[PDB]
Design a protein around this ligand. Structure first.
Ligand code: NAP
Ligand code: NAP
Ligand code: 9RR
Ligand code: 9RR
Ligand code: UMP
Ligand code: UMP
Lengths: 542, 547
C-alpha cells in the first residue's frame, strides 16, 4: 500500500567519523555517546590522512553488486513510472579527490554543484542541482544501490529529508583535528542493528556499524526442522526472565564485536542458567564450561559496555610478579581487592587462627615464584626457595617455544587450606608460533558481573607483558570458564548492560624499554582511546 | 535433463531398523556396515516393541508442512502434468500388512492422508477415511489429483523394496536403532551408487537403547539482509593455510555431508580444522605437527557413551589404567602383568636415564597421576612404599564435596604438581578435573594441556567419561556432560593420511556404558564391573601406516 522513497531506490549513506579534539571542565570524566565519532574532514583531506582497511571497506561496499537480485529491484523502481552502484558526493568532496582515482572506478559518479554545469565534465559523470533531482535520475538508470558518500551538509540534508535507508558508519577510534563535524544522527529516526569485529589499521582501532531507518537447498531446509524435532516450545528461565528485557540486544542482527563473546555468555546464563545456592547465600544462575577468545594483535579487550578502572588490577599483577603475600602492600596504595580476605574475622572463619591480619598465605604470587616452598609468614625471606614457575615459563618461551609444558599453576593442592582463599585463576598455558604468543587461562569460578571483566583485562595485560619481555608479539588471550555464574543481585544491572552497544576497543601500550618481567612499574602501562559507556554499580544498593 | 516422478511429487521413505541376531565363526570380531541396521519387523509388530523418541520423530516428519511452499509445489506438479491453475497435509503410503498391525485407536494416522496398497482388499473392506490402491502406478495418478505437501512411504519391506527398485524415493529418513532384537522382516540392502548418506543427527537414548537418524539422498546416477553479511566479510581472504598441501577430494565424503550433528563430529571437525588451519611446528618429538590452541568438546553421557566409531577402540587397557590411578599406584609392573603396555616405554632403564632419574627402578614411574590423586604433597620415595595418610587425598576430598557441598566451585582434582614434575617419568597431560552438580546430575570438565588428536584424545574422552560415571554412581547422581578442554591440540604428521581416511567415514550410533550398580565406593571397582554395549564401529586404523 505505502512504501518510502529510500526503500524503493535503495539509497544509503557510507562514512568514517573519528574522535574530535576538545577541551573540558577539568577531569576526564568525559561522557561518551554515538556523537563521540563525528570527525569527517580537515582542510580538504581525511582527519587521519590514510586508512588501508576503511578504504578496503569503502571500495568493497560501494562496488558490490548482486545481478541476480536486480530483476526484483528494477520491477520495484518501474512500478512507479554492466550493473554498477551509484555513488553521490558534494562538490568539495569531488575536488578533494586526485584525477588519478577519478572518476571512481566501477561506479556511476554523481556530484552536487549549484555552480558548474554538465557540459564540461569530460567523462560519463552526472551532475544535479538539488536532492529531489537525484530521484528522477535513478528512474533513467540501471544501478544496484545508491550510496551517499559526501561532505557534512550533503549528509546533513537527510535528518529531515529521511531519504537514507541505512548508514554504513566506520568508527575510527582516535582523536584528530577536524574542520567538519558529521550531522547528529537522531536516535529516534535511525538505530544501530549491526556491529562488526574490531580491527587495527594504521595505528588505530576501528569498527564498522550499521544504522537502519526505524519504522517509527530449498529441500534441505525441512531437514533442519526435522533434526530440531526434540526441542522444547519454551526456554528455562521464561518463568524468571522476560523477552522485552533485551529489546536492543535482541534487535541486533550481526553481533560480531568481540565484546559479544562476554555479553552472549551473560545472555546464555540468564536465559538457560541453573538456579543454585552457594557459599555466599545470594543465589546464582550457573552453567559449566565456556570459552572466549580475544585477538590482542587487533585490540585490547577492555569492556566498553561499562566503565572499568585498571590501576588496582595492574598493581595486583605487579604484586603477583614480585611474589608478595602481604595484603598491606596493596592497601597502602588504596588497592582494596584483597582487604576483606585478610580481616581477623575472615581468616578466623578459614581456621587460620595463627595468621596475621592481611597475611593472605601462599596465594598466587607465592606459587608463581616459590611453588612447594614451606610458607611461614608474609615477611620471611623466600629467595631461591621453591620452583620459580614464572622464570621457568619465560625461559621455555625463549628457548623451547614449541614446548607443550609452558604452564603457570596457582592451584597448589598441598597449600590450598593455608590460603586466605583458594585461587580462581587455576592456571595459564602459553603457545608460541611465528613469533606470536597466545595464552590460555582456566578459571574454575567466574563471577560474570564483577570478576570476569577484570579477569580478562588482567591476563591480557599479562600476555602483553610476557610477550614484550620475550621479544614476541601478543596473539590470542583465551579464557576458559568452569563454573560460570551470574549472582542474582547482578541480574538487573546486567539487563541494562546487554542493551548497550559496544564501542571499538582501546589499545594497550607498554613502555618498550622494559625487557625483564620484574621491571614493570605502574607508569609503564597506558590504556589509549578507551571509549566506554557509563559505570554500572553491579549491586545497585546504598 | 528433465524431471523424475519422485522429485515432482516429493516421494520419500521413512523407516526404523534395528540390528539382527546372527553368529560369527571365523572371528568373534563382527564386521559392521550400513546393512548392520536392517531389522524392520517381527511377528507382525516392531522388533523393539515401542520407542518413544523414534515415534515422536516419525510423527514430526510425516505431519510437518510448510504452507508457504505449496504454491510453488502446485506449479511444479501442474507444469509436469501439463495443466494450469482443509489445512494442508502430507500423504503416508503403507502396505496392507502394515495397516493391519496398526491399532484401531491410531487409525487412520492423524492429520495425514492415508493410502493403503492392497490387491486382496478394496475400499468396502475399510470403514476408514483412506484411499485404497492396487498398483504403484495408481499412487502417481492419485498424487496428481490431490492437494498435499509431501508423500512418505512408511513401509512394509515389500513396499520399501518395490519403491526403491523403481527409483521412486527421493530421500530415505532412516532411524538406526542401536540394539539387537528378534526379527522376521528386513529392510532392503540400499545401493550406495543409488543412495548416499547426506546428514546424521545427534545421538539419543530412548527405551534403553541409543539411536540416531540419518538421511540418505538419491545420487544423480524483508530481504536486504544477505548483502550486509558480504560487507562484514570483506577482510577474510579466500585461501586456507595448508589447503595447497591438503586436497579437496581427500575430504569428499566429509564435505559432502550437509548436517553433521553426530557428537563424534566434535572430534572430527577439530581434526579437520587443524589440517586446514593448523600451524606447522616442530616438537619435543622430532616428528612435527599441525597445531592449534584452545578447543572445547561436550558430550552428553545421559544420551550415549562417546566411544569413537569411525575406527575401532578397546577399553580394557584404559580401564585398568584408571583403576590403577584410583588405587594411587605408580608401579608400571602392575599394568604389564595385565598385558597393558600404555606406560611401558615410559618406564624403561633408558627412558628413565634420559629423564635423569638414574636412581629410579625400571617401571617406577614416580609421583604420577595416581600418587597425586591420593597423596599430593607427600614426598615420593619408591613405588613399593606405603604412603597411607600422607599428602592430600584429593580423590576422597572431591567425593566428600560432591556428596556434602555439591554447589562448591572448588571440586577439583589436580595432577599437575609443579614440585614433582621432574620426578615424574613424564609430566601429566590431563592436568585437572573440575566437577559440577545440578539437579541430581554430575558434569566433569577435564583440561588437557597437550592433546594428540590421532591417538590419545580418543582414549582420553573415553577415560574421563568412564570416570564421570564411576564418580557419579558412588555419589548417587546421574552422569550428565563430560566437557573436554584442549590446550595444545595437535595432529602428528605421520597420522595425517590415516585421519584423512577416518574423516570420510560416517559415524554409527554410539554405544552405552553400564556399571555394576552394587559398587558404592570409588575404590571397589574391578574390570568386570564395566560393560560397553552395542559398540558399532568401522575397521581398525593403525595410525602409523609405517607399522
Ligand atoms: N569521512 C567521510 O565520510 C567523508 C566523506 C566525504 C568527504 N569527506 C571530507 O570532508 C571534507 C568536505 O566536507 P563538505 O561537507 O564541505 O563536503 P561537500 O559536501 O563535498 O561540500 C559541500 C558542497 O556540496 C554541494 N551541496 C551541498 N548541499 C547541496 C544541495 N542541497 N544542493 C546542491 N548542492 C549541494 C555544494 O556545492 P557548490 O559550492 O557547488 O554549491 C556545497 O558547497 C573533505 O575534506 C573531504 O575529504 C569525508
Ligand atoms: N521398522 C519400520 O520402519 C517398519 C515400517 C513398516 C512396517 N513395519 C513392519 O513390517 C512388517 C510388515 O511388512 P511386510 O513387507 O510383511 O508387509 P507390507 O509391505 O506392509 O505389506 C505388503 C502387502 O501390501 C500389499 N502390496 C504391496 N505392494 C503392493 C503393490 N505394488 N500393489 C498392490 N498391493 C501391494 C499386498 O497386500 P495384499 O496381500 O492385501 O495384496 C502385500 O501383501 C510388520 O512387522 C510391520 O510392523 C516396519
Ligand atoms: C575511504 C574513506 C571513506 N570511508 C568511509 N567509510 N566512508 C566514506 N565516505 C569515505 C570517503 C570519504 C571522503 C571521500 O571524499 C573524497 C576525498 C576523500 O579523500 C580521499 C579518499 C580516498 C582516496 C582514494 C585513495 N587514496 N586510493 C584509492 N584507490 N581510491 C580512493 C577513492 C575512494 C583519495 C582521497 C570519499 C570517501
Ligand atoms: C514408529 C515406527 C516407525 N518409525 C519410522 N522412523 N519409520 C516408520 N516407517 C515406522 C513405522 C510406521 C508404521 C508401521 O506399521 C507397522 C505396525 C507396527 O507399527 C506401529 C504400530 C503403532 C504405532 C503407534 C503407537 N505405538 N502409538 C501411537 N500413538 N501411534 C502409533 C501410530 C503412528 C507405531 C508403529 C511400522 C513402522
Ligand atoms: O579473580 C576472581 C576471583 C573471584 N571470582 C569470584 C568467583 C566466585 O563468585 C568467588 C569465589 O568464590 P568460590 O568460587 O571460591 O566459592 O569469586 C572471580 O570471578 N574472579
Ligand atoms: O593421555 C595422553 C598422554 C599423552 N598424550 C600425548 C600429547 C602429546 O603428543 C604427548 C605428550 O608430550 P608432551 O606434551 O609431554 O611434550 O602425548 C595424549 O594426548 N594423551
Amino acid at each position: 500500500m505505502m512504501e518510502q522513497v529510500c526503500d524503493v531506490f535503495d539509497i544509503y549513506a557510507i562514512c568514517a567519523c573519528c574522535k574530535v579534539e576538545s577541551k573540558n571542565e577539568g577531569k576526564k570524566n568525559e561522557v561518551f555517546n554515538n556523537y563521540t565519532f563525528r570527525g569527517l574532514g580537515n582542510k580538504g583531506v581525511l582527519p587521519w590522512k590514510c586508512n588501508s582497511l576503511d578504504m578496503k571497506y569503502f571500495c568493497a561496499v560501494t562496488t558490490y553488486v548482486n545481478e541476480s537480485k536486480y530483476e526484483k529491484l528494477k520491477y520495484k523502481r518501474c512500478k512507479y513510472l554492466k550493473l554498477q552502484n551509484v555513488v553521490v558526493m558534494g562538490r568539495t568532496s569531488w575536488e578533494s579527490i586526485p584525477k588519478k582515482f577519478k572518476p571512481l572506478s566501477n561506479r556511476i559518479n554523481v556530484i552536487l554543484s549549484r555552480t558548474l554545469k554538465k557540459e564540461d565534465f569530460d567523462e560519463d559523470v552526472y551532475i544535479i542541482n538539488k536532492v529531489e533531482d537525484l530521484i528522477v535520475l535513478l528512474g533513467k538508470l540501471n544501478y544496484y544501490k545508491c550510496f551517499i558518500i559526501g561532505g557534512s551538509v550533503v549528509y546533513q540534508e537527510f535528518l529531515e529529508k529521511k531519504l537514507i535507508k541505512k548508514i554504513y558508519f566506520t568508527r575510527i577510534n582516535s582523536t584528530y583535528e577536524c574542520d567538519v563535524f558529521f550531522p547528529e544522527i537522531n536516535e529516534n529516526e535511525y538505530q544501530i542493528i549491526s556491529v562488526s569485529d574490531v580491527y587495527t589499521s594504521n595505528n588505530t582501532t576501528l569498527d564498522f556499524i550499521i544504522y537502519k531507518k526505524t519504522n517509527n537447498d530449498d529441500e534441505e531446509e525441512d531437514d533442519f526442522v526435522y533434526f530440531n524435532f526434540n526441542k522444547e516450545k519454551e526456554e528455562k528461565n521464561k518463568n524468571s526472565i522476560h523477552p522485552n528485557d533485551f529489546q536492543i540486544y535482541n534487535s541486533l542482527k550481526y553481533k560480531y564485536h568481540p565484546e559479544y563473546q562476554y555479553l552472549n555468555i551473560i545472555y546464555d546464563i540468564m536465559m538457560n542458567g541453573n538456579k543454585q545456592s552457594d557459599r555466599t547465600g545470594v543465589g546464582v544462575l550457573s552453567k559449566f564450561g565456556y570459552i572466549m577468545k580475544f585477538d590482542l594483535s587487533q585490540y585490547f579487550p577492555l569492556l566498553t559496555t561499562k566503565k572499568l578502572f585498571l590501576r588496582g588490577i595492574i598493581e595486583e599483577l605487579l604484586w603477583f610478579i614480585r611474589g608478595e603475600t602481604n595484603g598491606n602492600t596493596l592497601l597502602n596504595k588504596n588497592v582494596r581487592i584483597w582487604e576483606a580476605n585478610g580481616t581477623r574475622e575472615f581468616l578466623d572463619n578459614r581456621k587460620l587462627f595463627h595468621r596475621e591480619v592481611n597475611d593472605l598465605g601462599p596465594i598466587y604470587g607465592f606459587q608463581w615464584r616459590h611453588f612447594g616452598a614451606e610458607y611461614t609468614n608474609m615477611y620471611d625471606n623466600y629467595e631461591n626457595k621453591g620452583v620459580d614457575q614464572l622464570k621457568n615459563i619465560i625461559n621455555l618461551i625463549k628457548n623451547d617455544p614449541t614446548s607443550r609444558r609452558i604452564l603457570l599453576c596457582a592451584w597448589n593442592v598441598k597449600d590450598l587450606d593455608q590460603m586466605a582463599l583458594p585461587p580462581c585463576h587455576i592456571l595459564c598455558q602459553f603457545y608460541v608460533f611465528d613469533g606470536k604468543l597466545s595464552c590460555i587461562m582456566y578459571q574454575r569460578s567466574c563471577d560474570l558481573g564483577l570478576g570476569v571483566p577484570f579477569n580478562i583485562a588482567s591476563y591480557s595485560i599479562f600476555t602483553h607483558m610476557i610477550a614484550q619481555v620475550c621479544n614476541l608479539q601478543p596473539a590470542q588471550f583465551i579464557h576458559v570458564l568452569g563454573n560460570a555464574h551470574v549472582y542474582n543481585n547482578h541480574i538487573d544491572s546486567l539487563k541494562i548492560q546487554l542493551n548497550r552497544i559496544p564501542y571499538p576497543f582501546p589499545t594497550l601500550k607498554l613502555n618498550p624499554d622494559i625487557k625483564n618481567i620484574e621491571d614493570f612499574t605502574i607508569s609503564d602501562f597506558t590504556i589509549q582511546n578507551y571509549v566506554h559507556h557509563e559505570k554500572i554499580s553491579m549491586d545497585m544498593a546504598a
